[PDB]
RNA sequence: CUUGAGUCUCGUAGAGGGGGGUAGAAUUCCAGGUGUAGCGGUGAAAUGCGUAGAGAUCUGGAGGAAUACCGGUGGCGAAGGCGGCCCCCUGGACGAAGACUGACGCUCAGGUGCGAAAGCGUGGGGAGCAAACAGGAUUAGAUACCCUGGUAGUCCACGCCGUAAACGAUGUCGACUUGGAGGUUGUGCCCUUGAGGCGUGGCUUCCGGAGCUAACGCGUUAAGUCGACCGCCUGGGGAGUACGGCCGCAAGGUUAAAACUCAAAUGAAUUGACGGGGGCCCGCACAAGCGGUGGAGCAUGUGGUUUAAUUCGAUGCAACGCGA
C-alpha cells in the first residue's frame, strides 16, 4: 500500500547457487523444514539430468520454458462488474508462477515418494504434458478470451 | 464526412468524424429529447463557461 | 465467382452489435459477417475485438471474389467503429475511401425516452 | 406653456402574430435486386423479428412530424409563448434632425379579452414517441423502475376548458443613489485611412459599494431612498375541504367556512452526524501469498433441551478455552 523497496533477497542454491533455483527449493519447503526440502529438490533434479543427460539447470529451465506463462487477467471491481482485464506478467513474477505451479501440480501426482514425483512433472513439463503446463495454458486461455478488455 | 486520400498510406484521419458529426450528435439523440431540460441543463453550462 | 476486384464495406457500429457487409459499388451484397455470430454474445459481442474477428471473417467469405480495393461506409457509434476498418485493411484490402454515413436528422422524429435508472 | 403623454418623417433589429407555399436530413411502411443465419435487446436475459429468407445493403414509391449546423451569457412578446427558406396580410419596440398636439397622464374594484400542458366535442390526420393495455425480466413480492409491443393522445380545423413550481416564488407608473467587466441594437465624432478608438440613447448578463435584510442575499434592471393607485396576508392541522351561488358537455374551476384538535407550524443560518455525494489519505482492510476454520473424532465454552437442581454473570464487532 505504501511500502516499496524491491524484493526480499534470498540466499543462492547450496549446490549450484542459483537464485531462481533457490526460491524453487523454498516453494517446495514445508513446515519451515528447509533441510528435507533440499533433499527432495536434489533427489529429483538429479534424476532429471540422469535422463535428459543435460545440466540440472538447462534441464530444469526447459521444464519452466513450458509451464512459464506470460499473460494473466486481473479482476477490477468496477460498477458491480467483475471484469477480468488481462495483462502480461513481469519476468521476475513469470518464473515464480511456473515454479509454484510445477510443485503444487507435482505434489498431486499421487505417485510414491514426492522426491520422484517432482522429477516426473519436471520431465513432462519440458514438453507440455503434466498438469503444470495444463494450468499454464488455461491462464492464457482466460486472457485473450477477455482480450476485448485487453 | 467524406475522406479519400490519394497515395496509399493507410492513415485513418478520424479528425473529421471527431470534429462535429459522429458521437456527440448521436449520443445527444440516443435517449429521449429534452423539452425543458435543454433550456436549463444546457444553459447551465454558461454558468460554468463564465468562470 | 464474378470477380469484382473492388467494392465497398459497410459497418453497422451499433452500441450492442457490429456487422460488416461487403458489396460491389452497386449495393448488391457479396457477403457479410457479424460480431454476434462470430461467437461471443451480449457482454462479449459488444466489444471492439468483436468487430475484428467479424470483419476479418467477412473477407474470408467475399475475398473469394477476387477483390483488391474497397471503400468503407461507417455508420453509428459504439466499438468496432474503427476496429472493423483496421482489420479490413490489415487483410491486404487496398482501401481507398472512408466516409461516415451515420444518420443525423436535422431535427425530425422524436427519440424514445428509454433508460431511466 | 412644454419637460409628461401622443401624432408625423426617416431609419433599425427581431423565433412578435394570422394565412399560404416549399426544401433537405432522418425515422417508419410498401415493392423489387443482392445476400445468408442470424438480428434485436439487456447487467445478463427473455418476449419479439428470421430459412414463408430477417438484419445488413441497394433501388423506387407512400406518409407524418420536427426543423442539425447558425444558436448565444442571443432576440421578440402583456403574459402564455415564439426557431428551416419564401411570399401575403399585420402588431409593437428603439434611435434620431427635427415638425406637430398641448397634461390629452398614472393606477384600476367590477367588466372584457389573451391563457403551457393535460383534458373535452365534431370532422380530419396518424411516421416517431407513448398514459391504458399485453407480454418478457428483476424481486420475497414488483399491479414499478428495464426490455418487446401498443390505444388515447401528441399533429390540423373549429368550439370548450380556464388551470401550472402560469416563478424573478419579486404588481404597475414615475424620480433620485458609488463603481467594474461583458452582450445586443440605434446613433454621433474621430487621417474612420484601421480591425477600428471615443462618446451617447434602448434592451440585457455577471460582480459588487452604501444602504437594506432575521439570515441567505438584493444591490441604479434594488429587496436602497421616495411619491400614486391596486392586489393580498393575520398560527398549524382540519381545508382551498363542506354547504350555497356562479361557470362548465364533462373532468372540474371559481367564491369560501365551521366543529373538533395541537403548542407549536415555519424561514434562514450554525455545530455535528449520516449519504447506496465528491476529492485526498491511512490499517493483513483488500489485492499478492502462506497456513488454517467450515467436513471428521475428541477437548472446551455457549445456546437449547432436560433436570429436584443443572448456582450466578458475560450475548454484534466489544459474549461463547470469557469472570474460573
Ligand atoms: Mg415502454
Ligand atoms: Mg392541448
Ligand atoms: Mg381532440
Ligand atoms: Mg423584453
Ligand atoms: Mg450583486
Ligand atoms: Mg431548514
Ligand atoms: Mg502490520
Ligand atoms: Mg486475502
Ligand atoms: Mg486456502
Swiss-Prot record, chain A:
Q: Its Gene Ontology molecular function terms?
A: mRNA binding; rRNA binding; structural constituent of ribosome; tRNA binding
Its GO biological process annotations read: cytoplasmic translation; negative regulation of translation; ribosomal small subunit assembly; translation
**Superkingdom in the source lineage:** Bacteria
User: Could you state one GO cellular component term attached to this entry?
Assistant: cytoplasm
Q: Specify the effect of residue 114 to G.
A: Significantly decreases affinity for its own mRNA
Instruction: Give the UniProt keywords, A-Z.
Output: Ribonucleoprotein, Ribosomal protein, RNA-binding, rRNA-binding, tRNA-binding
State if tRNA-binding is listed as a keyword: yes
Remarks, miscellaneous: The strain K12 sequence is shown. Has been predicted to contact the N-terminal domain of IF-3 based on footprint studies; exactly how IF-3 interacts with the 30S subunit is controversial.
**Main role?**
One of the primary rRNA binding proteins, it binds directly to 16S rRNA where it nucleates assembly of the head domain of the 30S subunit. Is located at the subunit interface close to the decoding center, where it has been shown to contact mRNA. Has been shown to contact tRNA in both the P and E sites; it probably blocks exit of the E site tRNA. Protein S7 is also a translational repressor protein; it regulates the expression of the str operon members to different degrees by binding to its mRNA.
The subunit field of the Swiss-Prot or TrEMBL record says: Part of the 30S ribosomal subunit. Contacts proteins S9 and S11. Cross-links to IF3 and the P and E site tRNAs.
Family per record = Belongs to the universal ribosomal protein uS7 family.
Q: What is this protein called?
A: Small ribosomal subunit protein uS7
Q: What gene codes for this chain?
A: rpsG
From Swiss-Prot, chain B:
| Source organism of this protein record | Escherichia coli (strain K12)
What is the recorded function of this protein according to its Swiss-Prot or TrEMBL entry? Probbly involved in recognition of ribosome rescue factor SmrB in stalled/collided disomes; fusion of protein fragments to its N-terminus decreases ribosome rescue in the presence of SmrB.
Ranges of compositional bias, category Basic residues: 43-51
Q: What is this protein called?
A: Small ribosomal subunit protein bS21
What lineage, starting at the top, does this entry show?
Bacteria, Pseudomonadati, Pseudomonadota, Gammaproteobacteria, Enterobacterales
Gene Ontology CC terms, in alphabetical order: cytoplasm; cytosol; cytosolic small ribosomal subunit
Alphabetically ordered keywords of this record: Ribonucleoprotein, Ribosomal protein, RNA-binding, rRNA-binding
Stated family: Belongs to the bacterial ribosomal protein bS21 family.
**Any one Gene Ontology molecular-function term assigned to this protein's record:** structural constituent of ribosome
Q: Where does the source fall among the domains of life?
A: Bacteria
From Swiss-Prot, chain C:
What biological process terms from GO does the record include? cytoplasmic translation; translation
Q: Where are the transmembrane segments?
A: none
- PROSITE patterns recorded: RIBOSOMAL_S11
Asked if the Swiss-Prot or TrEMBL record annotates the protein with the keyword rRNA-binding, the reply is yes
Pfam families named in the record: Ribosomal_S11
Q: Name one GO cellular component term.
A: cytosolic small ribosomal subunit
The Swiss-Prot or TrEMBL record annotates one GO molecular function as: small ribosomal subunit rRNA binding
Keyword hit for Protein transport: no
Remarks, anything else? Has been predicted to contact the N-terminal domain of IF-3 based on footprint studies; exactly how IF-3 interacts with the 30S subunit is controversial.
Classification via HAMAP family: Ribosomal_uS11 (MF_01310)
Q: Which family does it belong to?
A: Belongs to the universal ribosomal protein uS11 family.
Subunit relationships: Part of the 30S ribosomal subunit. Interacts with proteins uS7 and bS18. Cross-links to IF-3. In stalled ribosomes contacts ribosome rescue factor SmrB.
Cited function:
Located on the platform of the 30S subunit, it bridges several disparate RNA helices of the 16S rRNA. Forms part of the Shine-Dalgarno cleft in the 70S ribosome.
Please give the name of this protein: Small ribosomal subunit protein uS11
Question: Lineage, please?
Answer: Bacteria, Pseudomonadati, Pseudomonadota, Gammaproteobacteria, Enterobacterales
